[PDB]
Amino acid sequence: ALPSLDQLLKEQGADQTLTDLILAILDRCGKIASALQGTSVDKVGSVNEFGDEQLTVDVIAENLLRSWAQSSEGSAVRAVCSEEDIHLQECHKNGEFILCWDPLDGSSIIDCNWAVGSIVSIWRIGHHGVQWQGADTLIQKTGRQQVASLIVVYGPRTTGVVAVNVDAGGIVKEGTALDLEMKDNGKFICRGKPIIKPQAKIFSPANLRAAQDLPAYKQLIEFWMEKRYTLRYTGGLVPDVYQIFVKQQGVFCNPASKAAPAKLRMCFEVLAIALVVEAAGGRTSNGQKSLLDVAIEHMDHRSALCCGSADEIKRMEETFAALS
Amino acid sequence: LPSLDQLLKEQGADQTLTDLILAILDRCGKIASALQGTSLTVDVIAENLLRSWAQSSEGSAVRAVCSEEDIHLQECHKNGEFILCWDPLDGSSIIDCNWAVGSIVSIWRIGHHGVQWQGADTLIQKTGRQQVASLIVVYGPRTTGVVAVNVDAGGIVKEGTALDLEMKDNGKFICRGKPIIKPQAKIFSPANLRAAQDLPAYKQLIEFWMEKRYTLRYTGGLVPDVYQIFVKQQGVFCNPASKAAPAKLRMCFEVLAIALVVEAAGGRTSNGQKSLLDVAIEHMDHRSALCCGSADEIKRMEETFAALSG
């Protein structure tokens, strides 16, 4: 859409305060894009929970977002937390927003120079029943209580998706997700409003090993191959779901099995993704319900996530129910 | 740290080949910029950057060129030495998704490895062992690549001579290491997956990789899909041919260049029966299966394709 991103966000119901916050966050993501382009792969000397060597770029990315939140330019931010420190850290006593982010997602593929990304979940005190309660402010909240979310993909260019959720009843309307592109001067524009079609041609099977002790997942994967669906799976969560918006079709799956439990984080990855997906008319599921309606049990809460084309999310639930 | 100029010379390149590689890499730098500041489509912009350079006085060392867009060998400079065959911008089905994409360049040299100028048919019946060099470039958050030089008599590629590259100031690259692809793999990257549906051996190999919990990494972009093998120093990429899903990868523009860099890093390559460096070019549009990476998985693939042939 040719109108400015500022105008489009306001048309989606964001006030100037939320609009400015989103634009400021995107600007920090633009700075992460620059850091990635000029920083070599240099190990810090410590592996993450998956065993992936953390790089200097991960710390730089975290610091770019955290330093901004703590600065006077981030005065609207009450508190933040991240995958590297999951506990709320106060930034500004009079700020309104709580931010939960994954500063640089794709630790197993960043060295390969594959596309990676960032994820930001945005909550607002006094909105959707979210009141400041210190450290446990987000406990028992659901994704439907976020006021906005966004993902940013760092590839040959910088792109992303953002959605606003300001309806008092939490109604998320199809066609409210905004596809973004950063101009090389750092300014973001909106290229369109993606609508994820109910039918899919692409499949993206994450946590593939779970199929070995989860028959339903093994059978869905076999089915997708038998029907000649196109395989597209980079191992980076943000790029793997961003493709669904661009192609306006596709299914991403990351189910949980006894042997291969869910590793995706509710607060730093899943809830943000669920909002942008459902704003584009896609469906999400943990096998039972939408990821906008699953309460946060703890800040480290992990969850399965399947998302994308409605018919495939339904096929997944039906197949998991039938087998068995 | 040693310059790329120094490193290329260490691998056997003379100043002329060194300068050619640096010029090609510089043009790839400009393709990186085109991708960063553009939305003519970028694949057309990339083709034009390489073509215009080759045709200019700056490209005087280039005798002739051809590409995916125009596979016919076209003479640029009568006194040039090199023949270039390139894939300007590869990854058409994923570029819109802002996923990593790449370029591939195969380099031949008149008077070297028995390649003499024969006009349009200069490369007919030539094999990949007759290339003097090749390179791949990956456009992602950074711009990286791999280059190998093949200047020893007989064209028998030495392990540990591939140079992993990273761009700093636009168009200028440094070497980030000399990858050695281990014989054992953890990652599998199954291209042309639909071929498995009428190629039992491929289906069974994929099932095996899944059952043994190999890690799936498959972007759909040829260049990034093979580049990971160099970075991780392990992995297997497969793009086989079946009757219903034939080989689409082009020998002259994709396959031979990749085969040289992989073998220079100690990996193996195969079309199901032999190295892609030993398959004669039958036609400029010649297509071929390509499997490459960790030696043990290439061995597994060849043995399975034989046993489960149907």
DSSP B219-253: -S-HHHHHHHHHHHT--EEEE---SSS----BIII
Residue A320 CB burial class (10 angstroms; 0-12, 13-18, ≥19) = buried
> What is residue A150's three-state secondary structure?
strand
Closest Cα partner for B139 from B120, B167, B110?
Answer: B167
Q: Per the CB < 8 Å rule, is A205 touching B215? A: no
How far apart CA A215 and CA A227 sit, in angstroms, is 18
Domains, chain A, in order of start with CATH, read 1-193 (3.30.540.10), 194-324 (3.40.190.80)
Q: Per the CB < 8 Å rule, is A156 touching B32? A: yes
| Resolution of this entry, Å | 1.9
How far apart CA A39 and CA B168 sit, in angstroms, is 9
Beta strands in chain A (DSSP E): 43-47, 53-55, 77-82, 89-90, 97-105, 116-124, 148-154, 158-164, 178-182, 188-192, 202-205, 230-231, 251-254, 283-285, 305-308
Q: Per the CB < 8 Å rule, is A115 touching B101? A: no
Is residue A219 a contact partner of residue A54, using CB atoms and an 8 Å limit? no
Beta bridge partners of A153: A117, A159
Helix (H) or strand (E) holding A222: helix A215-226
Among candidates B39, B97, B216 on the partner chain, residue whose Cβ is nearest the Cβ of A246: B97
Tokens of residue A18, six digits: 């939320």
- B contacts of A246 (beta carbons < 8 Å): 96-98
Using the structure block, give the residue that is written with the tokens 């792969």: A41
The CA distance from B89 to the nearest CA of chain A, in Å, is 12
Interchain contact B219–A (C-beta under 8 A):
yes
Query: Could you count the other beta carbons within 10 Å of the beta carbon of residue B149?
Result: 29
Q: Per the CB < 8 Å rule, is A112 touching B231? A: yes
Is residue B248 a contact partner of residue B265, using CB atoms and an 8 Å limit? no
Query: Could you count the other beta carbons within 10 Å of the beta carbon of residue B178?
Result: 17
Query: Could you count the other beta carbons within 10 Å of the beta carbon of residue A324?
Result: 6
**Nearest residue in B to A113, CA atom:** B140
Beta bridge partners of A188: A182
Q: Per the CB < 8 Å rule, is A225 touching B196? A: yes
Is residue A307 a contact partner of residue A159, using CB atoms and an 8 Å limit? no
- A contacts of B46 (beta carbons < 8 Å): none
Among candidates B36, B197, B231 on the partner chain, residue whose Cβ is nearest the Cβ of A157: B36
> What is residue A53's three-state secondary structure?
strand
CA geometry: angle B153, B286, B196, nearest 5 deg: 110
DSSP code of B281?
A: -
Question: What CA–CA distances, in Å, run from A191 to A5, A119, A203, A251, B84?
Answer: 10, 19, 24, 22, 37
Q: Per the CB < 8 Å rule, is A155 touching B141? A: yes
> What is residue B205's three-state secondary structure?
helix
Return the axis-axis angle of helices A310-322 and A215-226, rounded to nearest 10°. Answer: 130
Among candidates A38, A155, A208 on the partner chain, residue whose Cβ is nearest the Cβ of B216: A208
Is residue B123 a contact partner of residue B85, using CB atoms and an 8 Å limit? yes
CA geometry: angle B182, A47, A256, nearest 5 deg: 90
How far apart CA A153 and CA A156 sit, in angstroms, is 9
Residue from B92, B95, B219 to probe the interface with A (highest A Cβ count within 10 Å): B219
DSSP code of A123?
A: E
Is residue A276 a contact partner of residue A177, using CB atoms and an 8 Å limit? yes
Method: X-ray
Interchain contact B108–A (C-beta under 8 A):
no
Interchain contact B169–A (C-beta under 8 A):
no
Among candidates B168, B210, B220 on the partner chain, residue whose Cβ is nearest the Cβ of A211: B210
